[PDB]
């Protein structure tokens, strides 16, 4: 197929790994890898909550989330040695900014 | 010569204490918990629960997912290297 279709698609396994393979069912007391991402969720909350601060402020906190996830992922998979980037891919980058 | 009777008519103390509030949430907080988390279900298996229980469950916080991880991309790219020549 092609390249950058089939790094899309490896972004969206790792997303979906990350809050499925990372704790059993949910435990509360909490597992190893999951306690990163709810460092992350915490500093980003309690970022713009700083930020925009409004009401809404939670209503861009999932968006603020995935536009964070979504070039963390992205710049360790162009980071390996053999790939082939998509943020390197800077047409959908601009694009993206452009659109928000 | 008048003997009262109030210490006998007592019931709002027996309301009026404050556990009260607290028995009535954990006699149902309790009686449908897990006797001492037993675990709800413990059998797994399709040969990446396995994977799961010694990487992605409180087991190792090693670095050996990363690699695992890692390494199928360096394969991806580097056969492609060879699909492409």
Redesign the interface.
């Given at each position: 197929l092609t390249t950058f279709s089939l790094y899309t698609i490896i972004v969206l396994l790792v997303i979906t790994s990350l809050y499925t393979l990372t704790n059993n069912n949910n435990k509360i007391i909490g597992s190893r890898w999951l306690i990163s991402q709810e460092a992350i969720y915490d500093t980003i909350m309690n970022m713009t909550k700083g930020q925009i601060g409004g009401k809404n402020w939670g209503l861009y906190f999932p968006m603020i989330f995935t536009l964070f996830m979504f070039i963390f992922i992205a710049n360790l998979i162009s980071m390996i040695p053999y790939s082939f980037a998509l943020s390197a891919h800077l047409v959908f980058i601009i694009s993206l900014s452009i659109v928000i | 010569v008048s003997t009262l009777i109030p210490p006998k008519v007592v019931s709002s103390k027996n309301i009026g204490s404050a556990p009260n509030a607290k028995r009535i949430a954990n006699v149902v907080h309790f009686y449908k918990s897990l006797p001492q988390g037993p675990a709800?279900?413990i059998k797994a298996n399709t040969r990446l629960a396995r994977?799961?229980?010694k990487?992605?469950?409180?087991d190792?916080?090693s670095g050996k997912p990363l690699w695992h991880?890692?390494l199928g991309?360096?394969a991806?790219?580097?056969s492609?290297?060879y699909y492409f020549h």
């Open positions: - | 709800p279900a994977y799961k229980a990487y992605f469950d409180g190792n916080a991880f890692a991309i360096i991806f790219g580097y492609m290297e």
